[PDB]
Amino acid sequence: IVSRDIARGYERIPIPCVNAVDSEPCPSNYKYVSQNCVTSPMNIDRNITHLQYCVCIDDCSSSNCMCGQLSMRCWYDKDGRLLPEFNMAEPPLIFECNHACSCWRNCRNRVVQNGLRARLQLYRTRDMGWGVRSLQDIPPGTFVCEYVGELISDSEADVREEDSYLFDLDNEVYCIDARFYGNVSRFINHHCEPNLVPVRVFMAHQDLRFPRIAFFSTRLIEAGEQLGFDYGERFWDIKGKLFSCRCGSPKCRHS
Amino acid sequence: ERIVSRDIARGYERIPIPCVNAVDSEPCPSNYKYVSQNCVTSPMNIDRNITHLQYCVCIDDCSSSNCMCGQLSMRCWYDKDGRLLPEFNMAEPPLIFECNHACSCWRNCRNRVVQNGLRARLQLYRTRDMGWGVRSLQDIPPGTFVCEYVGELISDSEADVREEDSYLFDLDNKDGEVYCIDARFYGNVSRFINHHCEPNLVPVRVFMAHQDLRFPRIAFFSTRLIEAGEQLGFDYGWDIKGKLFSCRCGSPKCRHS
Ligand SMILES: Nc1ncnc2c1ncn2[C@@H]1O[C@H](CSCC[C@H](N)C(=O)O)[C@@H](O)[C@H]1O
Ligand SMILES: Nc1ncnc2c1ncn2[C@@H]1O[C@H](CSCC[C@H](N)C(=O)O)[C@@H](O)[C@H]1O
Ligand SMILES: [Zn+2]
Ligand SMILES: [Zn+2]
Ligand SMILES: [Zn+2]
Ligand SMILES: [Zn+2]
Numbered sequence: 342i343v344s345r346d347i348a349r350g351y352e353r354i355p356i357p358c359v360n361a362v363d364s365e366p367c368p369s370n371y372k373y374v375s376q377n378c379v380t381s382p383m384n385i386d387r388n389i390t391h392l393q394y395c396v397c398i399d400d401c402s403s404s405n406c407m408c409g410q411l412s413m414r415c416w417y418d419k420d421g422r423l424l425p426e427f428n429m430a431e432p433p434l435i436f437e438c439n440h441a442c443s444c445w446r447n448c449r450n451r452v453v454q455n456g457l458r459a460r461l462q463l464y465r466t467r468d469m470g471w472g473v474r475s476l477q478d479i480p481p482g483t484f485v486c487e488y489v490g491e492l493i494s495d496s497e498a499d500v501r502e503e504d505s506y507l508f509d510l511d512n513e514v515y516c517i518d519a520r521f522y523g524n525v526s527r528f529i530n531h532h533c534e535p536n537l538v539p540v541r542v543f544m545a546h547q548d549l550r551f552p553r554i555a556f557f558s559t560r561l562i563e564a565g566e567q568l569g570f571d572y573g574e575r576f577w578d579i580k581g582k583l584f585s586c587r588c589g590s591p592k593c594r595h596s
Numbered sequence: 597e598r599i600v601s602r603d604i605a606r607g608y609e610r611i612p613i614p615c616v617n618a619v620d621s622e623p624c625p626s627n628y629k630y631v632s633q634n635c636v637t638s639p640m641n642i643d644r645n646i647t648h649l650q651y652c653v654c655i656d657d658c659s660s661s662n663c664m665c666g667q668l669s670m671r672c673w674y675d676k677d678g679r680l681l682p683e684f685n686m687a688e689p690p691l692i693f694e695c696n697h698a699c700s701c702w703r704n705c706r707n708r709v710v711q712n713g714l715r716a717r718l719q720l721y722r723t724r725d726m727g728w729g730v731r732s733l734q735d736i737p738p739g740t741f742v743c744e745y746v747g748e749l750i751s752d753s754e755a756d757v758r759e760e761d762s763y764l765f766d767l768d769n770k771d772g773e774v775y776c777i778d779a780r781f782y783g784n785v786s787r788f789i790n791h792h793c794e795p796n797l798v799p800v801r802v803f804m805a806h807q808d809l810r811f812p813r814i815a816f817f818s819t820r821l822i823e824a825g826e827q828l829g830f831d832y833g834w835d836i837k838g839k840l841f842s843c844r845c846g847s848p849k850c851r852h853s
């Protein structure tokens with residue numbers, strides 16, 4: 342146990358680092374931030390009046406939920422999991438309820454905002470360096486963790502030498518560079534049959550340039566499984582020239 | 597006794613704050629929006645550049661005097677239970693710099709208190725002769741963080757044109773430019789705290805996740821033991837409003853009676 346909790350206790354649960362392959366110490370070239378941060382001034386519309394909100398007097402589980410309507414439909418169930426209706430292959434924007442809404446803090450449409458609740462562990466992989474794995478069975482359609490880091494412009498992103506920790510938001514483009522600041526997500530490797538899917542979300546602000554990226558389970562993840570998502574194409578078109586996917590799956594497109 | 601609301605905070609706080617009425621027939625106040633955190637309507641440019649943060653490199657629980665954060669606040673004024681030391685100057689309180697996400701230390705170090713939230717058992721209640729008030733339901737040790745004064749961030753320009761100024765609080769006194777918190781349209785339990793000439797609460801300026809020195813946050817600490825059932829109060833600032841409203845705190849030394 343090279344680290345008992347890489348998050349210095351900021352998260353709800355501890356995320357320990359372990360190594361039983363090589364003799365590398367707990368990674369420490371970065372700053373663990375549990376929430377997104379900015380260096381450059383990024384003007385985000387935190388005008389409260391500009392918030393779309395709902396006036397529900399239920400637990401926002403009726404279809405009168407404005408917040409639910411904005412997201413086409415409240416996609417959450419009673420256990421805070423996605424409905425089987427949820428389009429995994431082309432996910433919609435989700436608008437969770439916010440401090441502007443009339444409803445209570447425990448209504449159905451508050452999930453990603455509550456934080457990560459899963460048991461994760463940073464561990465050393467045989468062939469990919471560091472990786473993240475669950476220590477517990479994860480039901481399908483469960484919110485695992487948020488992709489968090491630094492907010493940068495496409496301008497800023499192109500001049501960045503190290504681009505291995507980036508994530509394109511909307512296509513003007515903004516980015517998250519998890520290189521210098523990030524959370525557990527920065528250590529998640531790629532996979533061609535992924536058990537994780539990114540979903541764009543809005544909570545306390547609805548500035549549509551700056552969605553937050555939540556990973557949901559695409560299937561059951563068994564305790565001990567390593568997480569993975571599809572990095573996309575720009576990665577494996579250039580970086581694929583140098584590296585190569587070693588997901589170890591029958592349908593590896595970038596082997 | 598009518599429990600007119602089981603929790604005025606819709607569960608945003610760590611504990612529920614219920615409203616009760618056992619004097620007149622007024623329903624739970626509702627011309628405002630309970631926000632647990634400070635908000636802005638107008639764009640207020642606050643420096644949330646992470647690199648602009650002063651931070652510490654403690655590897656302890658920030659209880660050594662090497663604590664940069666502690667140094668900035670002259671001294672970590674907190675004890676192990678998160679209460680102020682008896683050394684704390686009640687009559688002239690310093691700026692406090694709590695530890696932030698930039699620091700090297702853990703989230704449970706000594707110098708994180710106001711940031712953790714309100715933990716005490718409070719209750720919005722109807723007073724006989726002051727309208728609404730806030731009351732503790734439990735003994736409060738002296739030097740305990742009670743609640744934060746929270747609302748809308750507005751300029752002195754904006755504040756002067758505001759008709760209703762009963763819910764204001766001056767932050768950055770002079771320094772060329774002054775900002776305010778107007779708890780009128782958005783606020784928390786603090787907006788209901790009445791004045792008192794022998795106050796059991798004191799405001800203390802604090803910095804946590806940002807150190808933009810125009811925009812301190814205002815934390816109330818207990819100046820003494822508050823017994824379960826006592827109403828809270830602080831000294832407002834009467835300067836003008838006192839030109840007809842006469843204080844009914846009901847203390848022997850009421851200066852605005
Ligand atoms: N499925 C995969 N197969 C091979 N290399 C991968 C991979 N997913 C990520 N990587 C490598 O991971 C690098 C950094 S991103 C992930 C962090 C890295 N695993 C670490 O040890 O900290 C990339 O440069 C990429 O080459
Ligand atoms: N010591 C005091 N005696 C009487 N009224 C007071 C008081 N301190 C504050 N108030 C009243 O509190 C008003 C608004 S601020 C606090 C809210 C107030 N308790 C309410 O009835 O909602 C002031 O305008 C003033 O009239
Ligand atoms: Zn809701
Ligand atoms: Zn709703
Ligand atoms: Zn809502
Ligand atoms: Zn592959």
Ligand SMILES: [Zn+2]
Nearest residue numbers: 658695701705
């Ligand atoms: Zn600290």
Ligand SMILES: [Zn+2]
Nearest residue numbers: 652654658663
């Ligand atoms: Zn320190």
Ligand SMILES: [Zn+2]
Nearest residue numbers: 652665695699
């Ligand atoms: Zn510190």
Ligand SMILES: [Zn+2]
Nearest residue numbers: 793843845850
């Ligand atoms: Zn008085």
